[PDB]
Structure 1
Amino acid sequence: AHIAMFSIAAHGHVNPSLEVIRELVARGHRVTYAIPPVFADKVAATGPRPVLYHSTLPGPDADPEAWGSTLLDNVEPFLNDAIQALPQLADAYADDIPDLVLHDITSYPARVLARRWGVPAVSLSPNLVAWKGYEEEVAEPMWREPRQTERGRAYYARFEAWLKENGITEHPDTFASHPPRSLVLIPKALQPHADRVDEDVYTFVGACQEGGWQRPAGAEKVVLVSLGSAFTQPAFYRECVRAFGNLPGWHLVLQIGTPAELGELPDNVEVHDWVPQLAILRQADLFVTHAGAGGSQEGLATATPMIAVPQAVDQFGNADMLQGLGVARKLATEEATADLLRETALALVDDPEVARRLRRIQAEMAQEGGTRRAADLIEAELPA
């Protein structure tokens, strides 16, 4: 089959499904990938053929602030990009209409084209999705006042008119936030209101994902501290060193992203600017994490209890959810002192119920199935 994938040039909207694209190619499908030129090479590595289009969105290396800091500044760019991208893509595919459209959540043109072409669309979400009641519980209150401003009224009017020009009568919110079919590339454990998500629309597949690491001989408890790749806090690192430094039985791996700023280190502490995080987590008993999407899923994937110390807006939810699962404790940076970190660590690693819960979450993530399940489910949507 000819499967056409669509995304934007943003790491967090391309990296999550690259392996799925690779696997569909490996299985013998003809895969094309609508992508801005900066990500042509990234995409091509999968065996998919890049179909280039010009984007008006910030580049993949832009600061997070380039994407806006208000509701309308966040959403407007996706409509404006879509208005100018759609004709380029309609033109590109005109003589080679795909059998199935795959797309990241950010690509409105993919939605329009799938409908225009009369072919199935599968939305690939790298984050949480709407549950039943989301419209009344989250969307309506969030939009209530902005929608009534001249700017918000104009935005929705424009969006509706664009959809109507293209033969689409669905309300913009339905079109944007409510896909007919979706695969979700996070564990359902990190989905708010998971029991209320429509399983007829959404299927959770989890993350679709170097070097090794060896535990020091005789270490009873290994703790990894890693605040991810961006939001990486010297005072907190100092508290970590003080928490686990010279603590009998414990070995601390500290991922800092200067080692001098940390002071002289105890003998049971190893410091690195970068670590093979997954490799360490497979060999770790505790994970002190900022609760980013990757770290949170890897902690669960590896059944590693967590101290969640969220840094940025995108992490507080994950931290709350991890603690709610009974497999983590959330601390405010921040109050994350040596004494509290140590007590928290000791409580988590010794708790058999925490370990039971992690094992069950691992079992549940096994059922989600990742890359090869996502590929199986996509194939299942191919027309007869």
Structure 2
Amino acid sequence: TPAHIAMFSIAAHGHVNPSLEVIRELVARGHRVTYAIPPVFADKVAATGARPVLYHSTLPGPDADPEAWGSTLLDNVEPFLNDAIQALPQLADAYADDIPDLVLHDITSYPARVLARRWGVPAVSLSPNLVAWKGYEEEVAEPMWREPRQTERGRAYYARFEAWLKENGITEHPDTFASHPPRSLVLIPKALQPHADRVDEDVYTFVGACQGDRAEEGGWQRPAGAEKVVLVSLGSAFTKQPAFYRECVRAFGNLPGWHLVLQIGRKVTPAELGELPDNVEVHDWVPQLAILRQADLFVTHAGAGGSQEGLATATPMIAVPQAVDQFGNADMLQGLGVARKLATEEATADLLRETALALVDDPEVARRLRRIQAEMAQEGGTRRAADLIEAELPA
């Protein structure tokens, strides 16, 4: 008689993709898994074998640019409260006489936390980004929150948040409720966790290893004259670059022994790029892994899949973030001695080239990558996380 594990997330790729493999494995293990998700991701979720439970989220669909979330931290954070308040009852009612044995959820789902409590079952939080360490509150939250909190808006945000939890028997402060889960699996490698020396390892277990995505075998496969392959697979931060994808051509084009995979405004759109040399393939859509598995350098936006897979593929990286969060990845990657940090004003054909020739020729870069790949192997992937989830399953 199967345990019911209820998963919760929102319609955003970065909050669904990282755990799809885990959900897939839990189903493969015989658990009955339901997955609360908006309709746009129903197909995506059903493909894991989980039953989608549909609800209406007022958050921006997975198909939205980052003008659409908002410009200050209260603009970033309020939407999750607003959504949660109108999603809670939908979800409570959809699960009314089918109370799960265990609640799993991406960090964005406030309803999941509330319902786990209301139902008196354990919740397991699944983080696709870094988590709080012991000390973050004083260290980091304050000043960041220091100002918005003495504004009329921030006092009302926090007021409404209190009241809403109070409605649901919860007395934890909202910052506690939101940012400090009792139990969490962190889906990024420890190597990419700030001040990771201080994460509480009763609460949090790191499971950041590649287990999965398209584990496909063969994507594109190296032309058998390609000494050094450089995939440029998010290298940018998704913004217009009629100079950066072209700076990449000038860096690697006709560079003896090199071969350059570019991936563009992934809607085609150009004959900017111009007179492509013979060792330069450009595409709108690539299989970042089979490539990375045979690539020797990776120019990247450096988000989770991207910082992770290059580490996972022991591929040194030229870090081209263009976002404060990936500025922390960049100096973290760079901090580990396996990448050099670059912004677009900086990522010019010359400096791309000499940095590329540094990194691929640095035998210690390779040794460090080996080191990190081994630590991620240990952390475990899908089976690992699935184990940890079972180990909670009021069973």
- Same structural fold, with TM-score higher than 0.5 when normalized by the shorter chain: yes
User: Structure 1 residues 203-212 or 48-57, which shifts more?
Assistant: 203-212
Q: What residue number does 2:145 align with? A: 143
Which deviates more from structure 2 when the two are superposed, residues 300-309 or residues 247-256? 247-256
**Aligned-partner Cα distance in 2 for 1:341–1:208:** 27
**Cα distance between partner residues in 2 of 1:212 and 1:36:** 31
* 1:139-191 per-position Cα deviation (integer Å, ceiling 9, x unaligned): 11111111111111111111111111211111110010000000111111111
Q: Distance in 2 between matches of 1:104 and 1:236?
A: 34
What are the ranges of 5 or more consecutive residues in structure 1 without an aligned counterpart?
Answer: none
CA separation of 1:89 and 1:229: change in aligned 2, threshold 3 A: farther
Q: 1:312 offset after TM fit, Å?
A: 3.2
Q: 1:224 matched to which residue of 2? A: 231
State the secondary structure of the residue aligned to 1:342: helix
Give the Cα separation in 1 of the matches to 2:260 and 2:291.
11
- Deviation at residue 259 of structure 1 after TM alignment: 5.3
| Contact 2:209–2:377 (CA under 8 A) maintained in structure 1 | no
CA RMSD of aligned residues (A): 1.7
**Would you say the 8 A contact 1:228–1:292 is kept in 2?**
no
Question: In structure 2, do the counterparts of structure 1 residues 39 and 208 end up closer, same or farther at CA, with 3 Å as the change threshold?
Answer: farther
Partner Cα distance (2:295, 2:4) in 1: 43
Deviation at 1:289, TM superposition (A): 1.3
- Deviation, 1:207, is 5.5
CA distances 1:319-356 after superposition (whole Å, capped 9, x unpaired):
11110010000122112222221111111111111111
What is the CA-CA distance between 1:211 and the residue it aligns to?
A: 4.4
Alpha carbons of structure 1 residues 314 and 222: separation in structure 2 relative to 1, 3 Å: same
Q: Is the 8 A contact 1:228 1:295 kept in 2?
A: no
Instruction: Label 1:207 to 1:108 Cα distance change in 2 as closer, same or farther (>3 A).
Output: farther
| Cα-to-partner distance string for 1:62-118 (whole Å, 9 max, x where unaligned) | 222221211111111111111111122222222111110001101111111111111
Q: Tell me the distance in 1 between the aligned counterparts of 2:107 and 2:124.
A: 10
Evaluate the alpha carbon distance shift between residue 274 and residue 37 of structure 1 in structure 2; reply closer, same or farther with a 3 A threshold. Answer: closer
Alpha-carbon separation, structure 2, partners of 1:58 and 1:266? 40
Aligned partners of 1:270, 1:241: CA distance in 2, in Å? 10
Provide the TM-score with structure 2 as the length reference: 0.93
Alpha-carbon separation, structure 1, partners of 2:45 and 2:322: 31
Q: How far off is 1:292 after superposition?
A: 2.1
| Structure 1 residue 230 displacement after superposition | 6.6
Cα deviation 1:248-272 (Å, max 9, x = unaligned): 2222222223553112122222222
Aligned position for 1:39: 41
* 1:269-280 → structure 2 map (5 Å cutoff): 269-280=280-291
Q: Mapping of 1:63-82 within 5 angstroms? A: 63-82=65-84
In the alignment, the residues of structure 2 paired with residue 74 and residue 181 of structure 1 have an alpha-carbon distance, to the nearest angstrom, of: 24
**Deviation at residue 377 of structure 1 after TM alignment:** 0.8
Runs of 4+ in 1 over 3 A off after TM superposition: 207-211
Query: Are the aligned partners of 1:236 and 1:337 in contact in 2 as well (CA < 8 Å)?
Result: yes
Question: 1:214 Cα shift?
Answer: 2.3
Q: Which residue of 1 aligns with 2:214?
A: none
Aligned ranges for residues 204-353 of structure 1 at < 5 Å? Answer: 204-206=206-208, 209=211, 211-227=218-234, 231=238, 233-257=241-265, 258=269, 260-353=271-364
Matched residue SS, 1:383: coil
Distance in 1 (alpha carbons) for counterparts of 2:71 and 2:209? 27
Which structure carries more helix by proportion? 1
Cα contact 1:33–1:50 (8 A) shared by 2: yes
Distance 1:332 1:59, change over 3 A: closer
TM superposition shift of 1:360 = 0.6
Query: Which stretch has the larger CA shift, 79-88 or 121-130?
Result: 79-88
Shift of 1:30: 0.7
For 1:59 and 1:369, the matched residues in 2 are separated by 31
CA distance in 2, matches of 1:229, 1:43: 29
Shift, 1:374, TM fit? 0.9
Which piece of structure 1 moves more, 232-241 or 195-204?
A: 232-241
Q: Point out the more displaced range, 130-139 or 212-221.
A: 212-221
The 10-residue stretch of structure 1 (36-45 or 295-304) with the greater mean CA deviation from structure 2: 36-45
Residues 316, 369 of structure 2: 8 Å contact kept:
yes
8 Å contact kept, 1:19–1:208? no
Deviation of 1:362 (Å): 0.3
Equivalent residue of 1:240, what SS? helix
Structure 2 SS opposite 1:261: coil
Q: Whole-Å Cα distance in 2 between the matches of residues 75 and 20 of structure 1?
A: 27
Rounded to whole Å, the distance in 2 between the matches of 1:266 and 1:159 is: 57
Q: CA contact under 8 A between 2:236 and 2:320: conserved in structure 1? A: no
User: How many residues matched?
Assistant: 384
User: After the TM superposition, which of the residue ranges 336-345 and 222-231 deviates more from structure 2?
Assistant: 222-231
Structure 1 contact 16–208 (Cα < 8 Å) conserved: no
Q: Which moved more, 1:266-275 or 1:137-146?
A: 266-275
d(CA) in 2 for partners of 1:281, 1:208? 12
In structure 2, the CA distance between the partners of 1:214 and 1:41, relative to structure 1 (3 Å rule), is closer
How much has 1:44 moved relative to structure 2? 1.4
Distance 2:64 2:299 in 1: 28
Per-residue deviation at 1:217? 2.0
How far the C-alpha of 1:26 sits from its partner, in A, is 0.8
* CA separation of 1:187 and 1:170: change in aligned 2, threshold 3 A: same
Task: Check conservation: 1:17, 1:208, Cα contact below 8 A.
Answer: no
Q: Which runs of 5+ in 2 are unaligned?
A: 212-216
**Offset, 1:364:** 0.5
The offset of 1:234, in angstroms, is 2.6
Distance 2:233 2:284 in 1: 10
User: Shift of residue 357 of structure 1?
Assistant: 0.4
In 2, are the aligned partners of 1:120 and 1:383 still within 8 Å (CA)?
yes
More deviation in 226-235 or 299-308? 226-235
* TM-score between both structures, scaled by the size of structure 1: 0.96
- Provide closer, same or farther for how the CA distance between residues 62 and 237 of structure 1 changes in structure 2, counting only shifts above 3 A: closer
